[PDB]
Amino acid sequence: MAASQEIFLQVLNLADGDVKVTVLGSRNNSLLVESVSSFQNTTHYSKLHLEAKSQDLHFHLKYNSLSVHNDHSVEEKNCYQLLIHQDGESISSMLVKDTGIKPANGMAAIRFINTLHKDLNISLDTDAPLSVGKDYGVSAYRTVLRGKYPAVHCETEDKVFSLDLGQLDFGTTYLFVITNITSQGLQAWKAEDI
């Protein structure tokens, strides 16, 4: 997907307010400047130019008055998702690498990020459950039949929930961030890999 000394970056802002993102290179060079709204539901990707085949980029995040600096290592020819999340009264970021999954006739592919304090097991299919670890753990990708997933089984050490993953389309790789437990049950934010 991405070329030499190049990356694609998708910013997911899971904070309660807007965040201004400033990605910097090895010499105060602004590789990306973008403000993303709280749960901005966009399938938009930014191409970033690197100085080498591998680089540590500096992510400058602005949220309310607060400023947070996070470093994240990237590599050429790759696509990433920057998950900006709440860190108390402040915010923090995580960089998730995307695997390129060639479309499989009749199939979609899925992956989860667990923001809960308890580990999770998701029943997507007739095989093994999909494990997704507590405190921003990342699940494996699972190739699933295309279709509607209105009540996917989730379970912690002590409860079992339902998630509405909605329609999962062929030729699409999804990312689901398990945000909170409301009165209505478990909540999941849907995003699409590039």
Author numbering: 408 to 601
What does the paper say about this structure?
Mammals obtain nitrogen via the uptake of di- and tri-peptides in the gastrointestinal tract through the action of PepT1 and PepT2, which are members of the POT family of proton-coupled oligopeptide transporters. Here, we present the crystal structure of the extracellular domain from both PepT1 and PepT2 that reveal two immunoglobulin-like folds connected in tandem, providing structural insight into mammalian peptide transport. Functional and biophysical studies demonstrate that these domains interact with the intestinal protease trypsin, suggesting a role in clustering proteolytic activity to the site of peptide transport in eukaryotic cells.
The phases were calculated from seleno-L-methionine incorporated protein using the SAD method in space group P3221. A higher-resolution structure in space group P41212 was obtained using the P3221 crystals as seeds with a single monomer in the asymmetric unit. Guinier analysis of the scattering data in PRIMUS (Petoukhov et al., 2007) shows that PepT2ECD has a larger radius of gyration (Rg) compared with PepT1ECD, 23.1 versus 18.4 Å, which suggests an increase in particle size. Consistent with this analysis, 3D envelopes of the ECD generated using DAMMIF show that PepT1ECD forms a compact shape ∼48 Å in length whereas PepT2ECD is more elongated, approximately 61 Å in length. The larger envelope of PepT2ECD indicates that the two immunoglobulin-like domains are structurally more dynamic than the PepT1ECD, which is consistent with the loss of the second salt bridge and also the location of Asp505 on the unstructured loop connecting lobes 1 and 2. From this panel of potential ligands we observed binding only for the intestinal protease trypsin with both mouse PepT1ECD (KD 80 ± 0.8 μM) and rat PepT2ECD (KD 165 ± 0.5 μM).
